[PDB]
Amino acid sequence: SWEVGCGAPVPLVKCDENSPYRTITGDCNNRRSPALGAANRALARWLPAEYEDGLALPFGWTQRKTRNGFRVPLAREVSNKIVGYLDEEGVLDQNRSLLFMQWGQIVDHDLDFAPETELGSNEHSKTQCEEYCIQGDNCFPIMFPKNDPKLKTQGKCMPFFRAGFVCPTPPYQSLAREQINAVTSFLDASLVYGSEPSLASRLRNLSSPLGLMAVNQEAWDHGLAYLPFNNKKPSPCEFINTTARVPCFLAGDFRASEQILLATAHTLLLREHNRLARELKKLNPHWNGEKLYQEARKILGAFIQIITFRDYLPIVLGSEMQKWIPPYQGYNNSVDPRISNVFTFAFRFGHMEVPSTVSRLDENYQPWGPEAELPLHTLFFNTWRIIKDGGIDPLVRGLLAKKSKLMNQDKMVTSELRNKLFQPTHKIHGFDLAAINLQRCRDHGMPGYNSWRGFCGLSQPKTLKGLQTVLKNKILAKKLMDLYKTPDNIDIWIGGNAEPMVERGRVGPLLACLLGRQFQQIRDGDRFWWENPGVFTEKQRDSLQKVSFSRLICDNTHITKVPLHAFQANNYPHDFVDCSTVDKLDLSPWASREN
Numbered sequence: 314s315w316e317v318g319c320g321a322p323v324p325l326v327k328c329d330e331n332s333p334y335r336t337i338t339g340d341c342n343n344r345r346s347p348a349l350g351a352a353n354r355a356l357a358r359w360l361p362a363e364y365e366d367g368l369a370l371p372f373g374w375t376q377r378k379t380r381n382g383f384r385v386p387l388a389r390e391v392s393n394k395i396v397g398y399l400d401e402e403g404v405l406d407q408n409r410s411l412l413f414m415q416w417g418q419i420v421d422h423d424l425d426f427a428p429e430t431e432l433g434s435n436e437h438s439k440t441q442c443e444e445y446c447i448q449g450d451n452c453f454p455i456m457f458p459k460n461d462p463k464l465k466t467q468g469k470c471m472p473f474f475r476a477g478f479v480c481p482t483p484p485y486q487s488l489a490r491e492q493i494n495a496v497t498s499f500l501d502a503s504l505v506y507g508s509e510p511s512l513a514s515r516l517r518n519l520s521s522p523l524g525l526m527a528v529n530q531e532a533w534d535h536g537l538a539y540l541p542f543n544n545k546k547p548s549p550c551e552f553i554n555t556t557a558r559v560p561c562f563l564a565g566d567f568r569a570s571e572q573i574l575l576a577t578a579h580t581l582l583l584r585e586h587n588r589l590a591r592e593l594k595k596l597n598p599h600w601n602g603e604k605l606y607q608e609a610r611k612i613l614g615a616f617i618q619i620i621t622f623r624d625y626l627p628i629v630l631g632s633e634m635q636k637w638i639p640p641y642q643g644y645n646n647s648v649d650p651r652i653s654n655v656f657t658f659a660f661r662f663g664h665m666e667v668p669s670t671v672s673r674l675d676e677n678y679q680p681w682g683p684e685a686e687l688p689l690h691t692l693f694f695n696t697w698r699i700i701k702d703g704g705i706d707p708l709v710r711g712l713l714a715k716k717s718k719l720m721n722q723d724k725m726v727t728s729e730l731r732n733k734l735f736q737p738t739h740k741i742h743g744f745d746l747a748a749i750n751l752q753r754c755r756d757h758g759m760p761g762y763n764s765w766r767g768f769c770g771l772s773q774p775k776t777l778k779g780l781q782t783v784l785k786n787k788i789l790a791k792k793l794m795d796l797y798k799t800p801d802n803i804d805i806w807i808g809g810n811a812e813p814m815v816e817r818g819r820v821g822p823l824l825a826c827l828l829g830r831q832f833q834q835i836r837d838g839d840r841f842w843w844e845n846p847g848v849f850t851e852k853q854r855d856s857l858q859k860v861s862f863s864r865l866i867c868d869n870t871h872i873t874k875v876p877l878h879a880f881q882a883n884n885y886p887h888d889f890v891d892c893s894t895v896d897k898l899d900l901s902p903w904a905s906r907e908n
């Protein structure tokens with residue numbers, strides 16, 4: 314038999330064979346094979362892993378060893394000589410709002426999570442790594458090259474730890490090391506509810522039987538909900554500001570707090586759960602807290618799927634969408650809904666769409682006062698700005714009137730993320746997401762760029778001349794070549810994002826294929842897909858295709874003018890209409906009588 318083996322990080326409890334709801338861990342979605350899709354299982358491999366020693370070591374761990382005859386360049390150099398750029402002018406997407414970049418972060422979070430390894434608390438393994446930069450075990454440092462400013466100021470390297478893997482978390486030796494996805498593979502709102510039983514419970518307001526999610530006690534937004542604070546101390550949200558001491562938010566996903574905007578979207582989804590939960594009491598008064606919790610939750614899952622598949626993917630896969638995601642013909646038991654290891658790196662394209670600053674706007678959408686615009690890095694793990702500086706209406710207006718950063722070949726990643734990133738584990742805004750990303754592709758044992766080129770049925774460059782034509786850019790290919798000595802060693806992340814963009818989307822051929830495939834799979838393979846004959850009622854369905862993110866805002870904030878098409882660029886006030894004119898969720902085909 315196949316490696317029908319491992320699974321140790323795995324929880325395990327049972328399946329009700331005809332239940333009308335998703336489990337909290339994704340289990341039992343597939344009847345033949347229960348665990349398919351579930352949290353805490355290895356990420357799927359669409360191709361064999363590629364390691365230095367064959368089973369666990371990454372390329373660029375042993376200095377002597379080469380990859381196809383050449384040394385792999387240090388990550389931070391690829392970052393320095395290619396990704397980075399100085400001039401922020403003319404870098405914004407003329408036809409995408411900031412929201413376009415944010416919604417993506419929400420979905421890449423709903424689908425995947427690889428926790429780093431961590432067995433070294435109260436040991437000097439966190440110090441033997443940050444302070445002394447000595448490789449070993451799960452400490453895989455990002456070493457700085459020569460001619461690097463950070464050298465003169467931060468040390469020899471940036472600490473970095475390898476991602477957790479299945480079976481244990483200690484020394485494993487026989488099949489190749491596979492990394493862990495720690496959230497459910499189906500798009501189901503597990504970022505709002507959590508992917509664990511342990512946790513979905515702590516997020517809920519059980520004390521009361523209305524199916525409410527627990528909200529913040531200490532603070533309220535002009536009389537509105539706030540994700541609840543988190544116990545865990547030292548939470549670094551109070552480190553960026555020791556005077557204010559405002560903890561991070563506790564949510565379905567642990568990353569809710571990296572940045573003030575993602576934290577804002579998490580609050581817009583929480584309120585809406587409660588808004589639906591309490592409206593569902595009004596129409597079906599004999600429904601218990603659990604019943605309310607589920608049908609409410611079950612809906613939000615639909616809101617996310619719809620918007621994702623209706624308003625988000627076609628302006629991304631562009632014209633390529635149809636070549637990958639055929640219309641929906643119904644659940645197919647033979648499809649593997651799992652998230653592949655490569656997709657988790659393919660979705661990081663969203664990193665080139667992050668602008669350099671976040672704006673705050675007043676009611677007539679104007680600069681919210683003196684310091685209304687802040688550079689991005691002052692917002693990593695920043696909760697005090699929301700709590701003590703306006704709430705979210707000013708911020709949410711921002712995501713609409715403002716634009717995303719257009720990914721473009723000469724300016725890729727903003728400096729805010731490439732030079733001034735802040736990590737929870739350490740205490741300096743001084744990391745590089747590009748380098749970190751590039752190392753991560755290696756930690757996970759990812760096959761080179763041309764492998765994937767071949768996998769998707771695309772040509773495969775072997776020469777500068779070949780690379781110039783594919784990338785359609787002479788200088789870019791040249792630098793890629795000077796560093797990788799062969800298109801075959803080019804880390805897929807940099808590989809994928811350097812290809813020009815497909816017509817009407819925001820990503821190239823390769824990446825369109827990888828993403829194109831994954832969402833096709835998580836849709837055809839989701840038994841709880843919302844367009845699935847059975848999940849909701851026929852009337853209930855027509856009710857739902859009437860949703861917009863524009864409506865979501867109106868119901869949960871005090872913004873009165875929003876646009877009809879939140880994702881594409883929209884100016885105020887021409888493209889801004891008042892809430893009263895926006896279609897709404899008719900919760901009646903839900904209204905029960907006789908239950």
Ligand code: HEM
Pocket residue numbers: 414415416417418421425426427428571572656657658660661662663664666667730746749750753
């Ligand atoms: C201001 C915006 C953003 C910030 C500050 C940010 C920050 C980060 C950080 C620190 C990591 C951990 C990386 C690693 O250790 O390997 C990460 C991972 C990641 N990000 Fe982002 N990110 C942002 C936006 C986005 C967007 C917009 C997308 C997609 C549209 C995205 C997709 C991903 C993916 C796929 C990962 C690896 C995830 C996993 O599987 O655990 N990110 N980000």
Ligand SMILES: *[C@@H]1O[C@H](CO)[C@@H](O[C@@H]2O[C@H](CO)[C@@H](O[C@H]3O[C@H](CO)[C@@H](O)[C@H](O)[C@@H]3O)[C@H](O)[C@H]2NC(C)=O)[C@H](O)[C@H]1NC(C)=O
Pocket residue numbers: 553554555556557697701
């Ligand atoms: C950490 O957060 C602090 C509060 O959470 C923040 O200090 C607060 O912000 C400013 C200080 O410049 C003050 O706010 C308003 O009042 C001043 C006059 O004092 C006005 O001139 C300003 O326009 C402003 O609207 C608050 O009084 C101050 N609060 C306290 C208790 O001092 C810090 O700025 C943050 N520090 C860091 C390093 O991020």
Ligand SMILES: *[C@@H]1O[C@H](CO)[C@@H](O[C@@H]2O[C@H](CO)[C@@H](O[C@H]3O[C@H](CO)[C@@H](O)[C@H](O)[C@@H]3O)[C@H](O)[C@H]2NC(C)=O)[C@H](O)[C@H]1NC(C)=O
Pocket residue numbers: 408627628817881882
């Ligand atoms: C800014 O981006 C927008 C999306 O990329 C774009 O609007 C879209 O243009 C498409 C053409 O690809 C139109 O196509 C739709 O036509 C009818 C609706 O009348 C529908 O039956 C079809 O399904 C089809 O999607 C749309 O009108 C629009 N996109 C959507 C999803 O409706 C803008 O043109 C861009 N702005 C500029 C100035 O270029």
Ligand SMILES: *[C@@H]1O[C@H](CO)[C@@H](O[C@@H]2O[C@H](CO)[C@@H](O)[C@H](O)[C@H]2NC(C)=O)[C@H](O)[C@H]1NC(C)=O
Pocket residue numbers: 645646647648649
């Ligand atoms: C159900 O979905 C699966 C997707 O994995 C489909 O699998 C295809 O079936 C063919 C047989 O005709 C296999 O050779 C391939 O694995 C898949 N086709 C292609 C072109 O790759 C399956 O056909 C779907 N079937 C139904 C009835 O829905």
Ligand SMILES: *[C@H]1O[C@H](CO)[C@@H](O[C@@H]2O[C@H](CO)[C@@H](O)[C@H](O)[C@H]2NC(C)=O)[C@H](O)[C@H]1NC(C)=O
Pocket residue numbers: 518520521525527528529530
């Ligand atoms: C959710 O459960 C109940 C229901 O709202 C919350 O109790 C309310 O608390 C606020 C002030 O904290 C006041 O409206 C009343 O004291 C309570 N009203 C009712 C109807 O009970 C409780 O605060 C929430 N639970 C959590 C953990 O926040």
Ligand SMILES: O=C(NO)c1ccccc1
Pocket residue numbers: 422568571736737
């Ligand atoms: O994975 C993140 N964002 O997508 C993230 C991870 C660790 C610390 C801060 C942010």
Ligand SMILES: [Ca+2]
Pocket residue numbers: 423424496497498499500501502503504
């Ligand atoms: Ca999920």
